[PDB]
């Protein structure tokens, strides 16, 4: 549906030491218009992994509805086994890939953070079925904006902490709010570790407009 | 004169023997009981270990129907393992279609409709199983139902299934299960099961219990061994 389906915006995530942090904007975007200023685009899967998506918000809720059952399917068993982020990344890949074979794929972009087996497993899928693993992920215009900020610090600081993570993300969402038309100052800073998913509330960015007065 | 050769035929007395014979398989099945309380519902199972080769957790009659719903059965042990998926169908579909948790009555309806579906024909046989279903809700609370092999649903303050029913039921009618808490009665529930037990055929067994209620905040859970040992070792004091 090429109609104004309420598309999403750039979603960012990066690994830190023994954990993964994922950030996203709370602004639902209707076409070129910004309509919904408060939406929850991030779902928590058990304590182990957390998911977020870009593009169509409606197609996310269906997967949020389907995967919501898929995760409960294990709790329906009660056999003493769990789902790893690799298993969900696997399943979601095959699930998203089987849609385009019928020429009715879900139009969107998704990001999977997670932690399994003493390691933080980050993963990424795509509308077209592209799936891989990277230490940092950038979607939408984050690849055009936030990604070079990540690729610079990753080689400089392979080990990342929460303070280093946030400061990046805080400066990323700061630059994103400047250079993106469909972005908004409200965003979700969400973290996932071995202790479970914890999502911070709405936050803003610091603005330095001094370059404006220096025009004249 | 062969009136009962199939369930599709009514006897001259009007009584269907095949569905009744299917109940006789339940009447010979092992006895398990569960009772709702104000805080929630408790489930129990008496498992018969014939040989030492059986591992702990084997032959588990405690079933997980849904997040807030467990299950306990009496009959052929492979029967409800089909109904387990069927119960998960309504559990998944309702949460998929209507987007929230299913009440116990709506689940006990369509399942009882599916139990009665096989009593009709001559080309299928009715369920040789009988089970009870409890749950807990915020707007409703602890409810207790039971479905016989014929597919009948009744509301219950308490119920019993398996070999000896009125052996437990009359004792459950003597002791008031109404305003008591499941945490206090879980000790006495084992005592009732030990009273149902007798050593002629059966020799040794073990107790299997489950959690749903306010103690679990409505989400069906499983009891740990030590907390059950608190009831077990206390039931050993009441064993005599």
d(CA B33, CA B207): 11
Q: A76 vs B88: CB contact, 8 Å cut-off? A: yes
Q: Which helix (H) or strand (E) holds B44?
A: strand B40-48
H helices of B17-78, in order, are 17-27
Say whether residue B93 is in contact with chain A using an 8 A CB cutoff: no
Say whether residue A78 is in contact with chain B using an 8 A CB cutoff: yes
C-alpha distance from B93 to closest chain A C-alpha (Å): 9
Taking phi first (over 0 means left), then psi (-120 to 50 degrees means alpha), and beta for anything else, what does residue B44 get?
Answer: beta
Residues with Cβ within 8 Å of A3's Cβ and at least 6 positions away in sequence, in order, are none
Contact list, A64 vs chain B (CB under 8 Å) = none
- Best to test chain A binding among B58, B94, B96, B212 (most A CBs inside 10 Å): B96
Q: Which helix (H) or strand (E) holds B75?
A: strand B70-75
Residues with Cβ within 8 Å of B153's Cβ and at least 6 positions away in sequence, in order, are B108, B109, B112, B145, B146, B147
Residues with Cβ within 8 Å of B171's Cβ and at least 6 positions away in sequence, in order, are B192, B195
d(CA B152, CA A85): 44
C-alpha distance from B32 to closest chain A C-alpha (Å): 20
DSSP letter (8 states) at residue B51: S
Residues with Cβ within 8 Å of A133's Cβ and at least 6 positions away in sequence, in order, are A121, A122, A123, A124
For residues B234 and B187, the answer to whether their CB atoms sit within 8 Å is yes
Choose among B107, B112, B132, B143: nearest CA to B218: B143
Choose among B189, B192, B176, B180: nearest CA to B228: B189
For residues B107 and B90, the answer to whether their CB atoms sit within 8 Å is yes
- Best to test chain A binding among B71, B95, B216 (most A CBs inside 10 Å): B95
Say whether residue B219 is in contact with chain A using an 8 A CB cutoff: no
For residues B207 and B190, the answer to whether their CB atoms sit within 8 Å is yes
Residues in chain A: 216
d(CA A142, CA A17): 22
d(CA A142, CA A11): 7
Neighbours of B121 (CB within 10 A): 12
C-alpha distance from B102 to closest chain A C-alpha (Å): 14
d(CA A137, CA A153): 13
Instruction: DSSP for B201-223, please give it.
Output: S---EEEEEEEEETTTTTS-EE-
Say whether residue B238 is in contact with chain A using an 8 A CB cutoff: no
Can you tell me which residue has the tokens 């042990």?
A: B77
C-alpha distance from A192 to closest chain B C-alpha (Å): 24
Catalytic residue status for A7: no
d(CA A32, CA B80): 54
Can you tell me which residue has the tokens 């599709």?
A: B8
Tokens describing residue A46: 């058990």
d(CA B155, CA A145): 63
Distance separating the N- and C-terminal Cα atoms of chain B: 50
Q: Which helix (H) or strand (E) holds B225?
A: helix B225-237
C-alpha distance from B88 to closest chain A C-alpha (Å): 7
Say whether residue A62 is in contact with chain B using an 8 A CB cutoff: no
Beta bridge partners of A198: A191
Interface contacts A/B by beta carbons within 8 Å: 23
The technique is cryo-EM
d(CA A112, CA A192): 11
Tokens describing residue B38: 């104000």
d(CA B54, CA B39): 34
Choose among B232, B230, B227, B207: nearest CA to B215: B227
CA dihedral A148, A153, A158, A164 (to 10 degrees): -120
Choose among A178, A187, A54, A40: nearest CA to A108: A54
Can you tell me which residue has the tokens 């029913």?
A: B165
- Side-chain half-sphere CA neighbours of B136 within 13 A: 21
Report B:125-184 residues touching A (Cβ under 8 A): none
Q: What is the CA radius of gyration of chain B?
A: 18
Instruction: DSSP for B82-119, please give it.
Output: HHHHHHHHHHHHHHHHT-SPPPHHHHHHHHHHHHHHHH
Residues with Cβ within 8 Å of A87's Cβ and at least 6 positions away in sequence, in order, are none
Burial B32-60 (b: 16+ CB within 10 A, else e): bbbbbbebbbbbbbbbebeeeeeeeeeee
Taking phi first (over 0 means left), then psi (-120 to 50 degrees means alpha), and beta for anything else, what does residue B84 get?
Answer: alpha
Q: What angle do CA B175, B145, B70 make, to 5 degrees?
A: 100
For residues A19 and A192, the answer to whether their CB atoms sit within 8 Å is yes
Tokens describing residue B12: 């001259």
Give the start-to-end residue ranges of the domains of chain A: 1-216
d(CA B234, CA B193): 14
d(CA B80, CA B200): 28
Helix (H, G, I), strand (E, B) or coil at B146: strand
d(CA B109, CA B82): 17
Say whether residue A80 is in contact with chain B using an 8 A CB cutoff: no
d(CA B100, CA B92): 10
**Which whole-number Å values give the CA distances from A153 to A114, A122, A169, A174, A176, in the listed order?**
21, 18, 12, 17, 17
Neighbours of B131 (CB within 10 A): 28
Q: Which helix (H) or strand (E) holds B172?
A: helix B166-174
d(CA A107, CA A96): 10
**Which whole-number Å values give the CA distances from B15 to B3, B11, B20, B26, B75, in the listed order?**
10, 6, 8, 18, 21
Q: A76 vs B66: CB contact, 8 Å cut-off? A: yes
Beta bridge partners of A191: A21, A198
d(CA A35, CA B144): 47
Three-state secondary structure along chain A? CCCCCCCCCCCEEEEECCEEEEEEECCEEECCEEEECCCCCEEEECCCEEEEEEECHHHHHHHHHHHHHHHHHHHHHCCCCCCCHHHHHHHHHHHHHHHHCCCCCCCEEEEEEECECCECCCEEECCCCCCECCCEEECHHHCCCCHHHHHHHHHHCCCCCHHHHHHHHHHHHHHHHHHCCCCCCCEEEEEEECCEEEEEEEECCCCCCHHHHCCC
Residues with Cβ within 8 Å of B199's Cβ and at least 6 positions away in sequence, in order, are none
Q: B92 vs A78: CB contact, 8 Å cut-off? A: no
Say whether residue A75 is in contact with chain B using an 8 A CB cutoff: yes
Residues with Cβ within 8 Å of A80's Cβ and at least 6 positions away in sequence, in order, are none
Sheet holding B32-36, edge to edge: B158-161, B32-36, B40-48, B205-213, B221-222
Contact list, A72 vs chain B (CB under 8 Å) = 67, 92, 95
Can you tell me which residue has the tokens 């220096």?
A: A214
Taking phi first (over 0 means left), then psi (-120 to 50 degrees means alpha), and beta for anything else, what does residue A44 get?
Answer: beta
d(CA A28, CA A41): 9
d(CA A86, CA A121): 7
For residues A204 and A186, the answer to whether their CB atoms sit within 8 Å is yes
Neighbours of A202 (CB within 10 A): 12
């Amino acid at each position: 549906t090429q109609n104004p389906m309420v598309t999403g915006t750039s979603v960012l995530g990066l690994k830190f030491e023994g954990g993964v942090v994922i950030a996203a904007d709370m602004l639902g975007s209707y076409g070129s218009l910004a309509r919904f200023r408060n939406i929850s685009r991030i779902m928590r899967v058990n304590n182990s992994t957390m998911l977020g998506a870009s593009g169509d918000y409606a197609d996310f809720q269906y997967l949020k509805q389907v995967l919501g059952q898929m995760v409960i399917d294990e709790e329906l068993l009660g056999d003493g086994h769990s789902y790893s982020p690799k298993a969900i990344h696997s399943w979601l890949t095959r699930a998203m890939y089987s849609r385009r074979s019928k020429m009715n794929p879900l139009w969107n972009t998704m990001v999977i953070g997670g932690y399994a087996d003493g390691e933080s497993f980050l993963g990424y899928v795509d509308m077209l079925g592209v799936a891989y693993e990277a230490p940092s992920l950038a979607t939408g215009y984050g690849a055009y904006l936030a990604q070079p900020l990540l690729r610079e610090v990753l080689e400089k600081q392979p080990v990342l902490s929460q303070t280093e993570a946030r400061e990046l993300v805080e400066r990323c969402m700061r630059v994103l709010y400047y250079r993106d038309a469909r972005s908004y100052n409200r965003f979700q800073i969400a973290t996932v570790t071995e202790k479970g998913v914890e999502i911070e509330g709405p936050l803003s960015a610091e603005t330095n407009w001094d370059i404006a007065h220096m025009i004249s | 004169t062969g009136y009962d050769l199939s369930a599709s035929t009514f006897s001259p007395d009007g009584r269907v023997f095949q569905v009744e014979y299917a109940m006789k398989a339940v009447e010979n099945s092992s006895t398990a009981i569960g009772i709702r309380c104000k805080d929630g519902v408790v489930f129990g199972v008496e498992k018969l270990v014939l040989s030492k080769l059986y591992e702990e957790g084997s032959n588990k009659r405690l079933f997980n129907v849904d997040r807030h719903v467990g299950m306990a059965v009496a009959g052929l042990l492979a029967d409800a393992r089909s109904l387990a998926d069927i119960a998960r169908e309504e559990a998944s579909n309702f949460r998929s279609n209507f987007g929230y948790n299913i009440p116990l009555k709506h689940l006990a309806d369509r399942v009882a409709m599916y139990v009665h579906a096989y009593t009709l024909y001559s080309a299928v046989r009715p369920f040789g199983c009988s089970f009870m279903l409890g749950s807990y809700s915020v707007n409703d609370g602890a409810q207790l139902y039971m479905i016989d092999p014929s597919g009948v649903s009744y509301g219950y303050w308490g119920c019993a299934i398996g070999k000896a029913r009125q052996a437990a039921k009359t004792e459950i009618e003597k002791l008031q299960m109404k305003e008591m808490t499941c945490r206090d009665v879980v000790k006495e529930v084992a005592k009732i099961i030990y009273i149902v037990h007798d050593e002629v055929k059966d020799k040794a067994f073990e107790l299997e219990l489950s959690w749903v209620g306010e103690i679990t905040n409505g989400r069906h859970e499983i009891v740990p061994k030590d907390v059950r040992e608190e009831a077990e070792k206390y039931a050993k004091e009441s064993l005599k």
